[PDB]
Write a protein that binds this DNA or RNA. Structure first.
Ligand SMILES: Nc1ncnc2c1ncn2[C@@H]1O[C@H](COP(=O)(O)OP(=O)(O)O)[C@@H](O)[C@H]1O
Ligand code: BEF
Ligand SMILES: [Mg+2]
Length: 509
RNA sequence: UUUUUUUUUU
């Protein structure tokens, strides 16, 4: 299908809510709702995308805009307008399906729809229901029946669950599907699900298999996403609306980025603790930060350390996929409103989540995918605010920083070295209450995660894997100690005849 | 000795 590039333009006429109203693109009722939010104007992505999404042309839309620049309302606004435009047709049916890669992001988008409802009660008739995992299925279906929503927000697993059973009842008149964080939803592990979703919606559609228009939004996408999306894009033409230059880096330029390089992976823990200590002192505890970590087990561990160091100074919140969904939702609600605190999380929190006035994003180790560097640091410097980011890595992780330059054109100007004092090591290690078996579980989780990104980040396996494994000895304060394991375990992992494996593990069976 | 998420509260 034909990709029509509309690149970033410098001197184009400003689009406003009033101008869209006067032109007849927006109804008074949606104009009202957004106006009462009292935004200075519409963000570039909003100015660029609202009219084309609503256009009577037979096209799909792809939109790139940097983190925190209003992509959500960029699709919610025209969606509401479409509901108003067709308000007498199929009024009890879902007309827009919005898909997101995490439950908390889907629930956030639902909360944004609710903000529109609250700014004009006249829009409550265009109801919305979220379909996400970890919530009561029956209770959600009762809500579908009671409210008969025109907008569904969902995560892929639960949506498929619902579609396999109820696609005929609610989903035969869908006109739009939106993939928020589209590049993530088209990666392995989501792509098959999005193709299943798209296939069901297209099959069940009462007009035709090509009726549904598809909108793709992300801070990170290019021409290659069209290929990946080929099986789910129905229309003969695709409009690519870009608010970023082709050779311009996708990272938000307002973010003051730095990297702190240690000799050992474990030393990044001490570096982060000292950094947070300094920030709490210098900002007089007026400090709101997010710290990312590679695995669930390590995130949980890092949270324990940070509570011991800092719970007296600030709240420490633990956020990952093994936290119950009720608790995930309450901590998201709290961190959105809190002035200060530290959110400790996995990449569950890397994309989309809008926590106002985060001062700093910290990272211990590398993200789960290259693009997530940009999304992680984009949790700060949102909606015109300032922000900083610090990447804490060890020397053997440096090829990641080179790949950011080579692949994504991101050059981190501020780079410095770190070496922990014996004092900070003793302070941090003494409060660790984990048993050796727990430390083994934690470090093994790191070995497995780092192993899966060796090719992507161009790591040297022979250096990175022993370095990660050596974290076990460092945390037990005995550098020559190796991780005790069984031969069957080493066989499973695939390192039983390797010198790399012998440097990491001791076969204490 | 589940590597980030993602139905299985249908
Ligand atoms: N026109 C606007 N002017 C100022 N702030 C806005 C505008 N539209 C949305 N916002 C705010 O910007 C923040 C980030 O929006 P979001 O849609 O999450 O960004 P993105 O999805 O592009 O990362 C939200 O708090 C939202 O209320
Ligand atoms: F690009 Be955003 F932080 F959803
Ligand atoms: Mg977003």
């Amino acid at each position: 299908s034909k990709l029509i590039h509309v690149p970033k333009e410098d001197n184009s006429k400003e689009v406003t809510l009033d101008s869209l109203l006067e032109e007849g693109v927006l109804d008074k009722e949606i104009h009202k709702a957004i106006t009462r939010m009292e935004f200075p104007g519409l963000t570039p992505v909003q100015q660029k995308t609202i009219k084309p999404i609503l256009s009577s042309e037979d096209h799909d839309v792809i939109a790139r805009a940097k983190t925190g620049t209003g992509k959500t309302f960029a699709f919610l606004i025209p969606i509401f307008q479409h509901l108003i435009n067709t308000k007498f047709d199929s009024q009890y049916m879902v007309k827009a399906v919005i898909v997101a890669p995490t439950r908390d992001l889907a629930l956030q988008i639902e909360a944004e729809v609710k903000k529109i409802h609250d700014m004009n009660y006249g829009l409550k008739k265009y109801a919305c229901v979220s379909l996400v995992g970890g919530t009561d299925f029956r209770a959600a279906m009762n809500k579908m029946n009671k409210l008969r929503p025109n907008i569904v927000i969902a995560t892929p697993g639960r949506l498929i669950d619902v579609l396999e059973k109820y696609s005929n009842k609610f989903f035969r008149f869908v006109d739009y599907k939106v993939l928020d964080e589209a590049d993530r939803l088209l990666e392995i592990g989501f792509r098959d699900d999005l193709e299943t979703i798209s296939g069901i919606l297209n099959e069940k559609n009462s007009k035709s298999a090509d009726n549904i228009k598809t909108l793709l939004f992300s801070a990170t996408l290019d021409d290659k996403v069209q290929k990946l999306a080929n099986n789910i894009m129905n229309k003969k033409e695709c409009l690519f609306l870009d608010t970023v230059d082709k050779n311009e880096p996708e990272a938000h330029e307002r973010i003051d980025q730095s990297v702190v390089i240690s000799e050992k992976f474990a030393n990044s823990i001490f570096a982060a603790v000292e950094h947070i200590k300094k920030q709490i002192k210098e900002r007089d505890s007026n400090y709101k930060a997010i710290i990312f970590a590679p695995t669930v087990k390590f995130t949980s561990f890092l949270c324990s350390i940070l509570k011991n160091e800092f719970k007296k100074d600030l709240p420490i919140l633990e956020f990952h996929g093994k936290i119950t969904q009720n608790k995930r939702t309450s901590l998201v609600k709290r961190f959105k409103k809190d002035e200060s605190g530290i959110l400790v999380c996995t990449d569950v929190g890397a994309r989309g989540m809008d926590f106002p006035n985060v001062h700093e994003v910290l990272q211990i180790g590398v993200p789960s995918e290259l693009a997530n560097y940009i999304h992680r640091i984009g949790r700060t410097a949102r909606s015109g605010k300032e922000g900083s980011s610090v990447l804490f890595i060890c020397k053997d992780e440096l090829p990641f920083v080179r790949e950011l330059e080579d692949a994504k054109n991101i050059v981190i100007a501020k780079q410095e070295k770190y070496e922990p004092s014996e004092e900070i090591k003793s302070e941090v290690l003494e409060a660790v209450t984990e048993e050796p078996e727990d430390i083994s579980d934690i470090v093994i989780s790191l070995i497995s995660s780092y192993r899966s990104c060796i090719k992507e980040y161009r790591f040297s396996e022979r250096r990175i894997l022993p370095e990660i494994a050596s974290t076990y000895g460092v945390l037990l304060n005995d550098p020559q100690l190796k991780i005790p394991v069984s031969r069957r375990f080493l066989d499973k992992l695939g390192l039983s005849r390797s010198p790399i494996g012998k440097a990491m593990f001791e076969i204490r069976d």
